Design goal:
Elements lengths: L1 H7 L10 H7 L4 H12 L2 H4 L4 H13 L10 H15 L10 H13 L9 H6 L3 H6 L4 H12 L14 H16 L6 H13 L14 H16 L7 H23 L16 H23 L5 H16 L3
Bound molecules: ligand A1EKX, magnesium ion and zinc ion.
Length: 324
């Protein structure tokens, strides 16, 4: 097995890594081994004096606090967002733009960004007067909680992978991570896309032709949108991966609707197993959310993302062709 796993980890720099095979081959530890691989690949253990055993201990505890009984928002999803972010960090239009602290902030943010997700939406948790929504006053309920858990687990035994950062490093990292995770709230998609379009309209390059980011506001905005794109990258992946991500999100929404049934609440969109239209939902999802976002990202990093935009469009075509 470990030879086969090691073989698959050779694709970690590739869009469309078989994240599901890696989950099998690593014994349901995709998040731990893809993070480990990426930290070695970016030489982050030595840059930040992260002890290897501390890194593994933390990664396994983090992976544990993703719910294995949740169909979509589990550790496989987290592994895939970490790995997609890692590919997007390497894009040529971003070369040498981001410090190693920002690279670590982004990768860390991706890893924790959905931890302890209960498999239901913010709105469901607001609507059922959950403790989470009560704790967080109905605003970015899950995303605040993923942050709260991601950081808290650093305090478990031999889990503080940031123990050797400077105090100023930790401070900057923490703020960047919060700023990134809070931006994965889907209720902020339109605004984040709006601001990203504005950045593309006013884009500035360097003498190297690489993107020019003067200040925290612009730099965190690019990392926010990057991890957001990675979060919304399932329909840009090879169709065999895309389809399995759809099967998983559909099952999670369907389970939520059932909970909405046993409560007399109305069923949210796309959550009713007796009134589903999965293909048309994917096409609408691509047309109104996913393709607008990625087209904008593609203009930002043009032409670095063309093959990704290609696959999205092919996949969009294909989901259309299966519509009755
Ligand atoms: C609050 O904002 C929304 O409700 C909005 C976002 C989105 O719902 C989501 C969230 O609120 C928060 C996180 C997520 C992730 C996905 C998602 C992921 C993959 C999908 O299909 C494929 F890519 F695998 C997917 O399909 C969307 C759909 C059926 C209509 C949704 O949808 C999410 C649809 N409506
Ligand atoms: Mg989320
Ligand atoms: Zn996510």
């Amino acid at each position: 097995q470990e030879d086969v796993l090691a073989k698959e980890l050779e694709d970690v720099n590739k869009w469309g890594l078989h994240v599901f095979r890696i989950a099998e081959l690593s014994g349901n530890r995709p998040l731990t081994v893809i993070m480990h691989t990426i930290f070695q690949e970016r030489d982050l253990l030595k840059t930040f004096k992260i002890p290897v055993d501390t890194l593994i201990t933390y990664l396994m505890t983090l992976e544990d606090h993703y719910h294995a009984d949740v169909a979509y928002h589990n550790n496989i999803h987290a592994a895939d967002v970490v790995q997609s972010t890692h590919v997007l960090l390497s894009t040529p239009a971003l070369e040498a733009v981001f410090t190693d602290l920002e690279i670590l902030a982004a990768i860390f943010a991706s890893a924790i960004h959905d931890v302890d997700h209960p498999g239901v939406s913010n709105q469901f948790l607001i609507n059922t007067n959950s403790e989470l929504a009560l704790m967080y006053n109905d605003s970015s309920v899950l995303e605040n909680h993923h942050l709260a858990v991601g950081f808290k687990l650093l305090q478990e035994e031999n889990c503080d992978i940031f123990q050797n950062l400077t105090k100023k490093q930790r401070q900057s990292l923490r703020k960047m991570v919060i700023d990134i995770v809070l931006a994965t709230d889907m209720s902020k998609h339109m605004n984040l896309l709006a601001d990203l379009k504005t950045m593309v309209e006013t884009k500035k390059v360097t003498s190297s032709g690489v993107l020019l980011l003067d200040n925290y506001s612009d730099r965190i905005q690019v990392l926010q949108n990057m991890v957001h794109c990675a979060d919304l990258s399932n329909p840009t992946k090879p169709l065999q991966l895309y389809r399995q991500w759809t099967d998983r999100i559909m099952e999670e929404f369907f389970r939520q609707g059932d909970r909405e049934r046993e409560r007399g609440m109305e069923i949210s969109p796309m959550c009713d197993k007796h009134n589903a239209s999965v293909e048309k939902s994917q096409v609408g999802f691509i047309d109104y959310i996913v393709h607008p976002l990625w087209e904008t990202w593609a203009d930002l990093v043009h032409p670095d993302a063309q093959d990704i935009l290609d696959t999205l469009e092919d996949n969009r075509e294909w989901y259309q062709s299966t519509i009755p």
